[PDB]
Curated annotation (Swiss-Prot), chain A:
Null allele phenotype: Decreased degradation of DNA with free ends that is unable to undergo homologous recombination, which can fortuitously lead to more efficient viral infection. Cells are deficient in DNA recombination repair and have increased sensitivity to UV light. The cultures have many inviable cells. Cells can be transformed with retron Ec48-containing plasmids.
Result of changing residue 9 to A: Acts at variant Chi sequences
Role description: A helicase/nuclease that prepares dsDNA breaks (DSB) for recombinational DNA repair. Binds to DSBs and unwinds DNA via a rapid (>1 kb/second) and highly processive (>30 kb) ATP-dependent bidirectional helicase. Unwinds dsDNA until it encounters a Chi (crossover hotspot instigator, 5'-GCTGGTGG-3') sequence from the 3' direction. Cuts ssDNA a few nucleotides 3' to Chi site, by nicking one strand or switching the strand degraded (depending on the reaction conditions). The properties and activities of the enzyme are changed at Chi.
Impact when changing residue 12 to A: Acts at variant Chi sequences
Organism: Escherichia coli (strain K12)
Gene: recC
Miscellaneous comment in the UniProt entry for this protein: In the RecBCD complex, RecB has a slow 3'-5' helicase, an exonuclease activity and loads RecA onto ssDNA, RecD has a fast 5'-3' helicase activity while RecC stimulates the ATPase and processivity of the RecB helicase and contributes to recognition of the Chi site.
Domains: entry comment: The holoenzyme may undergo conformational shifts upon DNA binding: the nuclease domain of RecB may swing away from the DNA exit tunnel in RecC. When Chi DNA binds to the RecC tunnel, the nuclease domain may then swing back to its original position (that seen in crystal structures), allowing it to nick the DNA 3' of the Chi site and then rotate to load RecA. At high Mg(2+) the nuclease domain may swing back more frequently, explaining differences seen in assays performed at high Mg(2+).
Effect on the protein upon substituting residue 11 to A: Does not act at Chi
Self-association and partners: Heterotrimer of RecB, RecC and RecD. All subunits contribute to DNA-binding. Interacts with YgbT (Cas1). (Microbial infection) Lambda virus GamS protein interacts with the enzyme without displacing any of the subunits.
UniProt similarity note: Belongs to the RecC family.
Protein name (Swiss-Prot/TrEMBL): RecBCD enzyme subunit RecC
Section covered of the full-length record: 126 to 250 of 1122
Length: 125, 98, 72, 187, 147, 49, 62, 98
DNA sequence: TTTTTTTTTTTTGAGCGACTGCACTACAACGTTGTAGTGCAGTCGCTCTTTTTTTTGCTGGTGGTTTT
C-alpha cells in the first residue's frame, strides 16, 4: 500500500510537476516544500537508477514532454504526418499543463481553441 | 487479519498512536493543523477521547480548548459515556463558565 | 375540495432516435471455415488492421490467431 | 378519497355438511379453528419460509429440537428401554452438545422424563387401536383410536398445560365413550 | 487570540452528524448575518451590535467574512470518529495505519464468533466436575455474551 | 404569547416515556379514544411487519 | 464533494494554477450549468428529511 | 418520544406518566470517587452495589432533569407511591428510591 | 442411460419474594393444656429500557459501449 500510494504520487508528479522530478533526478532538493520530501527525492532517484539499470527504457511522460517541446522549438522544417488545423472545443478538452506543447504546436499547425468563458471582460488575476 | 475497522477502533487506534513515543510529535502536527478546539457535548465523552484531548491540548501555548457541555444531561451511560470523566475534566481545569 | 388531473394535449416528443442500418432492418479450406458473427468480425478486424502495401507475414498471422484464439 | 374501504372478512358463506365426516378433520378443526377455516374451506394456507442454517453448533437445546428429543426420550422410557443407547444415538447425530454439557443436558432431561414416566406407567395397561363408527345428527364419523386400554384413554406428551390438548383429549373422550368404553380419560 | 485563524483551522467537535449539519448551517447563517451587518454598519441584535462595536475596521472584517462564507464548504466541522479517522488517514506514518480499510457497522457477529471460539477452546476439554459448575453459571455462550 | 393566540393542535402535546413497552401502552391507551399518535423513537425495521 | 488530502503529498501543501481539485471543479461545474441554461433552470434538492421530518440544508452554492 | 431522543428538541405541552417508575441495578460496575476510573466488581459485595446504585440514581436524576427541561408552556407529572418491594403494606414506600 | 412420487403441525420462562396452611416444640396458665414462635411445603404475583458514530479517487489523464 505504501508503494501504491508513492506510485500514485509519482504519477501525479509526472503529470503535473515535471520540474520537481527533473530537479530530483539530478540530486538537488527544492526549497520551500513540506516535510515529506527527504524520503521521496532519494526514492525517485533510486527509481530512475533502477529503471536505468534494468532493460526498461528511460522515457516517461515528463522527459518526453520536454523532448517534444525541444524538438518543436528548435526545428526549422516541419515534420511530416501533422494535420493542418486542430480544433479544441471546451475548457476541459485540454488540461492546463499541455499549453507549452500547444504553443510549440502552434508554430506549425493552426490551432483554434474555442474558449467558453462566462464573462466577456478580463476577470482573472 | 481482514483489514477491517470499527467505530471504537478509530478511537482505540488514535489512543494507541498517541500512547507511543513518536506519536506525541504527531500531536504537535495536530497543533500545526488545528491550533484551537471547541468541543460540543462534553457529557458524552469516553475516557479514551478525553485522554486524546488531554494529550493534545493540555498546557501547550497558542492553542485554546473550549469544552462546552452540561453535566446534568449525561444520560448516555449505557452507550459508553461517563460523568466521572467530566468530573475529572472539571478537577483538572481551573476556569468555569455558565 | 374538488380536484381533477390534467390531460396531456400533445405528445412530448416525436419518433426521434439515432439509428443505424441494423435498426432499419483438402481438410483446410475457407469453405470449411466456421460461419458466425464472431469469425466475421474477426475477419473484418484482420482486413482492417493489415496494411495493403506491406507483404503479409506468416508469423504475424500466427500472432493474430494467437491473440484471437483460433486454431494454429 | 372516493373509493370503498376494506370490508369485513367474515361473511355468511353457503356450506352443506356432508354425510361422512372423518375424525381427523374434527381434530384438525378443534386444534385450530381459524387455520382450519383458512386452509380447508377456501384452501388458503399461508406458507412461511423455513429458517436459515445457523453458523455454529447447538450449545443449548431449545424449541423444536428439544421437543423432539423430549418426545423420543418419553417414547423410549415408556417401554423401559435403555436410555444410554438413545443417548449415544443422539450424540452420534450431533443434536447434543459436545463433551460433558450434552451429558448434563441428557441427565436432566432423563431425570425429568423419568419423573414423568413414574406417573405415566403407574397406571398403564397394554391396549390396541380400535375402530370408531358413529352416526350423530345424520352425520357419519369413521375413524380409529390408537392405544385403547380397558382402563380408558392414556396419552402422554412432553408439553405444558394448555387448552388445545385438553380440547383434543375431550374430543377423544367423547368419541370413545359414545360407543362403549366405560372409564376415565387422562393426559 | 494572538492571531486570526481561517476556516480550515477552527475545529468543532459534535457527536451527532445531524447536529454537526445543523451547527454548520447555523454558523453559515451567522457568518452571512454578520457580513450583512458589517456591510450595513447596523443590526437588530444586541450581541451583533456589541460585535460591531468591538471592531474598528469594517472593510477588512467584511472581506474576512466573505472569505469565510466562501470557505464554509471546506470547514473543519467534523464528528468525533470522523476527526479521528481524518487524523489517522492524514498522518498515517506516525500512527501506523493502512490506507484503504473497510468499515463495518455491526460488530455483534464477530463478537459472537469470538465468544464461541473462547467457549470452544475453554469449556470443551473440561471434565464433568467443572462443566457442571460452568453449566450452573451459564447455559451457553449466549448468556455469557449477554453478560 | 403577549396578545397573540394559537389553538392547541395534536402535534403540540407530547408524551415522554422511557421504554418501548410503556410507549406501546400509551399508544394503545390513546388509540382507544379515537386519537392517532406517532412514535418518533420507533427504531423497528419495516421488514419485520 | 470534498476530498481529504493524502497527508504527505507536496502538491496539497503548495498549490499552483493548473492543479486538479474536486472542490473547485464542482464549483465551476455549477457555474457552467448556470451559464449553459438557455430557457429554464430547475434546481431541486432534499430540503426535508423523510424519516423524522428534520430540516435539511441545501448546498453553499444554491 | 423517549428521553434520549428528546435532547435538544422543543415541545409546547409535555406529559410524563411514568416518571416515578425506577429500575434497580443488580450488576456491580461503578467508578472510584478518587481515581475516577471504571471498576467492575465480579464478586457480590454490597459496597460496590451501593456505589453503582448511587450512579444509577444520578443517571435517573439527570434523565428527570432532561425530561423536565423540554416543556415550554406546560408539563404534567405522574406521581404515585410506588413500592418496588414485594410487601404490600410495610409502612414505608420506595419513592425515595426513585 | 432411463426415471417415481409427496402436502400433516408440534414448542417455548424462571428466579425472587410473599401468602397461607399445617406441624412442632417452649413456656406460662390452670400433671395437663392453650398460646406463641419458627420450619417446611404448596400456591401465586412479577417482570425483564434507553442508540449512533464513514475514506472510497465523476473523465487519476495511451482514457472513450453497441455495428457490421
Amino acid at each position: 500500500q505504501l508503494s501504491s500510494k508513492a506510485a500514485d504520487l509519482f504519477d501525479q508528479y509526472l503529470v503535473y510537476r515535471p520540474d520537481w522530478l527533473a530537479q530530483w533526478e539530478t540530486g538537488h532538493l527544492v526549497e520551500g516544500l513540506g516535510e515529506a520530501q527527504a524520503w521521496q527525492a532519494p526514492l525517485w532517484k533510486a527509481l530512475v537508477e533502477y529503471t536505468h539499470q534494468l532493460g526498461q527504457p528511460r522515457w516517461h511522460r515528463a522527459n518526453l514532454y520536454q523532448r517534444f517541446i525541444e524538438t518543436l522549438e528548435s526545428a526549422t522544417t516541419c515534420p511530416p504526418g501533422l494535420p493542418s488545423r486542430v480544433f479544441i472545443c471546451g475548457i476541459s478538452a485540454l488540461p492546463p499543463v499541455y499549453l507549452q506543447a500547444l504553443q510549440a504546436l502552434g508554430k506549425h499547425i493552426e490551432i483554434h481553441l474555442l474558449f467558453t468563458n462566462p464573462c466577456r471582460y478580463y476577470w482573472g488575476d | 487479519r481482514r483489514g477491517e475497522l470499527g467505530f471504537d477502533d478509530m478511537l482505540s487506534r488514535l489512543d494507541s498512536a498517541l500512547r507511543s513515543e513518536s506519536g506525541e510529535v504527531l500531536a504537535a502536527a495536530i497543533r500545526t493543523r488545528f491550533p484551537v478546539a471547541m468541543i460540543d457535548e462534553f457529557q458524552d465523552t469516553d475516557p479514551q477521547q478525553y485522554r486524546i484531548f488531554r494529550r493534545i491540548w493540555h498546557h501547550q501555548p497558542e492553542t485554546a480548548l473550549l469544552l462546552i457541555g452540561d453535566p446534568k444531561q449525561a444520560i448516555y451511560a449505557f452507550r459508553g459515556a461517563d460523568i466521572f470523566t467530566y468530573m475529572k475534566a472539571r478537577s483538572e481545569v481551573h476556569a468555569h463558565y455558565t | 375540495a374538488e380536484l381533477n388531473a390534467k390531460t396531456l394535449q400533445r405528445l412530448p416528443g416525436d419518433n426521434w432516435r439515432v439509428t443505424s442500418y441494423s435498426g432499419l432492418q483438402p481438410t483446410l479450406t475457407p469453405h470449411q471455415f466456421p460461419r458466425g458473427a464472431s469469425p466475421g468480425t474477426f475477419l473484418h478486424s484482420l482486413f482492417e488492421d493489415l496494411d495493403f502495401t506491406q507483404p503479409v507475414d506468416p508469423n504475424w498471422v500466427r500472432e493474430k490467431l494467437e491473440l484471437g484464439g483460433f486454431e494454429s | 378519497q372516493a373509493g370503498k374501504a376494506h370490508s369485513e372478512f367474515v361473511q355468511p358463506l353457503p356450506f352443506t355438511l356432508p354425510e361422512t365426516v372423518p375424525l381427523e378433520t374434527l381434530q384438525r378443526f378443534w386444534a385450530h379453528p381459524v387455520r382450519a377455516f383458512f386452509q380447508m374451506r377456501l384452501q388458503v394456507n399461508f406458507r412461511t419460509e423455513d429458517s436459515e442454517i445457523p453458523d455454529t453448533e447447538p450449545f443449548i437445546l431449545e424449541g423444536l429440537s428439544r421437543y423432539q428429543i423430549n418426545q423420543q426420550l418419553l417414547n423410549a422410557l415408556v417401554e423401559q428401554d435403555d436410555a444410554e443407547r438413545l443417548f449415544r444415538r443422539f450424540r452420534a447425530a450431533g443434536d447434543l452438545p459436545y463433551g460433558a454439557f450434552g451429558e448434563i443436558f441428557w441427565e436432566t432431561q432423563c431425570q425429568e422424563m423419568q419423573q414423568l414416566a413414574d406417573r405415566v406407567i403407574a397406571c398403564r395397561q397394554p391396549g390396541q387401536s380400535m375402530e370408531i363408527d358413529l352416526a350423530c345428527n345424520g352425520v357419519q364419523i369413521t375413524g380409529w383410536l390408537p392405544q385403547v386400554q380397558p382402563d380408558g384413554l392414556l396419552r402422554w406428551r412432553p408439553s405444558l398445560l394448555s387448552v388445545a390438548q385438553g380440547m383434543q383429549l375431550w374430543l377423544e373422550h367423547l368419541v370413545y365413550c359414545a360407543s362403549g368404553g366405560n372409564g376415565e380419560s387422562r393426559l | 487570540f494572538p492571531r486570526p485563524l481561517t476556516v480550515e483551522e477552527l475545529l468543532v467537535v459534535t457527536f451527532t452528524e445531524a447536529a454537526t449539519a445543523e451547527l454548520r448551517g447555523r454558523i453559515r447563517s451567522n457568518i452571512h448575518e454578520l457580513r450583512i451587518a458589517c456591510l450595513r454598519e447596523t443590526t437588530d441584535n444586541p450581541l451583533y451590535e456589541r460585535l460591531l462595536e468591538e471592531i474598528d475596521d469594517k472593510a477588512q472584517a467584511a472581506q474576512w467574512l466573505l472569505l469565510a462564507e466562501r470557505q464554509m464548504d471546506e470547514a473543519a466541522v467534523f464528528t468525533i470518529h470522523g476527526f479521528c479517522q481524518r487524523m489517522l488517514n492524514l498522518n498515517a506514518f506516525e500512527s501506523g495505519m493502512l490506507f484503504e480499510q473497510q468499515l463495518i457497522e455491526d460488530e455483534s457477529l464477530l463478537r459472537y464468533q469470538a465468544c464461541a471460539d473462547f467457549w470452544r477452546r475453554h469449556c470443551y476439554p473440561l471434565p464433568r466436575e467443572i462443566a457442571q459448575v460452568v453449566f450452573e453459571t451459564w447455559k451457553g455462550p449466549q448468556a455469557l455474551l449477554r453478560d | 404569547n403577549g396578545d397573540d393566540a394559537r389553538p392547541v393542535r395534536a402535534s403540540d402535546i407530547s408524551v415522554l416515556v422511557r421504554s418501548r413497552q410503556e410507549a406501546a401502552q400509551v399508544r394503545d391507551a390513546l388509540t382507544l379514544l379515537e386519537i392517532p399518535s406517532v412514535y418518533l423513537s420507533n427504531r423497528d425495521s419495516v421488514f419485520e411487519t | 464533494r470534498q476530498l481529504a488530502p493524502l497527508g504527505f503529498d507536496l502538491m496539497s501543501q503548495k498549490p499552483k494554477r493548473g492543479d486538479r481539485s474536486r472542490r473547485d471543479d464542482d464549483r465551476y461545474l455549477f457555474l457552467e450549468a448556470l451559464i449553459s441554461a438557455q430557457q429554464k433552470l430547475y434546481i431541486s434538492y432534499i430540503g426535508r428529511s423523510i424519516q423524522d421530518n428534520s430540516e435539511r440544508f441545501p448546498s453553499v452554492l444554491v | 418520544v423517549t428521553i434520549h431522543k428528546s435532547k435538544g428538541l422543543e415541545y409546547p405541552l409535555v406529559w410524563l406518566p411514568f416518571i416515578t417508575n425506577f429500575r434497580v441495578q443488580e450488576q456491580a460496575f461503578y467508578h472510584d470517587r478518587h481515581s475516577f476510573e471504571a471498576v467492575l466488581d465480579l464478586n457480590a459485595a454490597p459496597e460496590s452495589v451501593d456505589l453503582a446504585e448511587a450512579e444509577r440514581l444520578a443517571e435517573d436524576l439527570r434523565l428527570l432533569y432532561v425530561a423536565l427541561t423540554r416543556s415550554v408552556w406546560h408539563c404534567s407529572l405522574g406521581v404515585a407511591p410506588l413500592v418496588r418491594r414485594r410487601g404490600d403494606k410495610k409502612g414505608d414506600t420506595d419513592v425515595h428510591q426513585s
